[PDB]
């Protein structure tokens, strides 16, 4: 065990190892401080989880979160530098702190040149290929979930309405949506980077879908055959039929290859959207694409998601993950 020190930071105590110095509050959801990591010489972000073990739900969320962050090992996905607790045993274990690279800013704080959009969208797809290869769905892709440093290097995390980037099938509350909902979000972000405007700034879920169908058109026959819900079908079929808009007209002035890729990402029927791996080979990324440097992820065991355990059990599991953590090289 290293040596800890305690300080108060905005009605919130912090007990961190001496390796982390000069803590400076940085914003809240858990609470986060900037620090300097004396072991590496790097600026780090330290998140203290709040009430990680208050309820079975929080406890399982805490475990979720730590297992996920321990597994993500890719240049365009947030990685875990360190995890620690000031607790000396399972008995006294109550607090969890996560350490990551301090990221410059988000995508939210930044119309962009076509080459900038190429590189940023490339990095998102490259990270998402990786995430999707472990059978994870991000589900919350939006500019504020993308950290971008001054070199335009990009990492996906999960800390402007979320709903504006959500796939129309989620708006429709389809129970079996899949990983292509993330590709939808990337299409919405890409559009926003090209035009400087939110593509679908819906005020709620009804308005969200309405704006979506305005661009992409009402469901064709092939898609309507896949809808099980009678109510959803009455809704859909009762709408004034709209054709898919011409994306060339709508995005006139934008690189035709960016237009082509948007067409491939924002297809209404999710079975027809381009995957992340396919999008990487798209001609729009010829500057960047390297098929031998787009790794997939180690197998990821998410079987714990189906399990119903006591709070102390999820707490014990989390402690095990804390203790087993091996820092990155
Ligand atoms: O907290 C989170 N990030 C920020 C973070 C972390 C550590 C150290 C300092 C910070 C600071 F300082 F940047 F916030 C985070 C949490 C959860 C999560 C997951 C499941 N349940 C609950 C929460 N997931 N992702 C995530 C990662 C990759 C991905 F593809 C999708 C999401 C996160 O980045
Ligand atoms: F108005 C609509 C109708 C269908 C969608 C949709 C897009 N991709 N997949 C679906 C879908 C598939 C199976 N069942 C559902 F309920 C939805 C989105 C909005």
């Amino acid at each position: 065990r290293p040596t800890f020190y305690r300080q108060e930071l905005n009605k919130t105590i912090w007990e961190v190892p001496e390796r982390y110095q000069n803590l400076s509050p940085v914003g809240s959801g858990g609470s986060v401080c900037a620090a300097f990591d004396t072991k590496t010489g790097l600026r780090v972000a330290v998140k203290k989880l709040s009430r990680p073990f208050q309820s079975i739900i929080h406890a399982k969320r805490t475990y979720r979160e730590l297992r996920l962050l321990k597994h993500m090992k890719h240049e365009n996905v947030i990685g875990l530098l360190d995890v620690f607790t000031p607790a000396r045993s399972l008995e006294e274990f109550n607090d969890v702190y996560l350490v990551t690279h301090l990221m410059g800013a988000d995508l939210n704080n930044i119309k962009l040149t076509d080459d900038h959009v190429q590189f940023l969208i490339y990095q998102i797809l490259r990270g998402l290929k990786y995430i999707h290869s472990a059978d994870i769905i991000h589900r919350d892709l939006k500019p504020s979930n993308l950290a971008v440093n001054e070199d335009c290097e990009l990492k996906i995390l999960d800390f402007v309405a979320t709903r504006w980037y959500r796939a129309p099938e989620i708006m429709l509350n389809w129970m079996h949506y899949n990983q292509t909902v993330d590709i939808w979000s990337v299409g919405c972000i890409m559009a926003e980077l090209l035009t400087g405007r939110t593509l679908f700034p819906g005020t709620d879920h009804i308005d969200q879908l309405k704006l979506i169908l305005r661009l992409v058109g009402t469901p064709g026959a092939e898609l309507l055959k896949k809808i099980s819900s009678e109510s959803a079908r009455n809704y859909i079929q009762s709408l004034t039929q709209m054709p898919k808009m011409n994306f060339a007209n709508v995005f006139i002035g934008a690189n035709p290859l960016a237009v082509d890729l948007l067409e491939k990402m924002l297809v209404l029927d999710s079975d027809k959207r381009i995957t992340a791996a396919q999008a990487l080979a798209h001609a729009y990324f010829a500057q960047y694409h390297d098929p031998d440097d787009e790794p997939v992820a180690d197998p990821y065991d998410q079987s714990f998601e189906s399990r119903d355990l006591l709070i102390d059990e999820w707490k014990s599991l989390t402690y095990d993950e804390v203790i087993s953590f091996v820092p990155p090289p």
Side-chain angles (χ1 to χ4, degrees), residues 32 45 47 64-65 68 78 98 100 131 138 157-159:
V32 185
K47 184 183 201 192
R64 182 170 294 107
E65 186 172 3
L68 235 168
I78 178 170
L98 309 179
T100 64
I131 289 167
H138 184 288
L157 60 142
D158 198 331
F159 271 122

Side-chain angles (χ1 to χ4, degrees), residues 16-35:
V16 304
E18 222 97 287
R19 106 129 109 152
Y20 306 106
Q21 258 300 331
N22 282 102
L23 269 72
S24 167
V26 69
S28 290
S31 63
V32 185
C33 290

Side-chain angles (χ1 to χ4, degrees), residues 280-301:
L280 289 161
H282 190 277
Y284 186 57
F285 304 116
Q287 263 195 106
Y288 292 115
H289 166 57
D290 177 357
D292 292 318
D293 189 18
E294 295 160 351
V296 296
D298 282 1
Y300 182 51
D301 179 23

Side-chain angles (χ1 to χ4, degrees), residues 167-177 180 209 212-213 217-219 223-229 232 235-236 239 267-271 273:
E169 63 273 31
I170 288 177
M171 289 303 102
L172 200 68
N173 204 222
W174 183 28
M175 234 190 117
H176 299 289
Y177 65 79
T180 68
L209 180 66
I212 283 165
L213 299 183
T218 57
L223 182 44
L224 259 159
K225 295 177 163 175
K226 305 192 255 199
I227 308 176
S228 33
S229 178
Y235 186 81
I236 289 322
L239 300 167
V267 188
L268 169 64
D269 180 343
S270 80
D271 290 333
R273 285 175 205 153

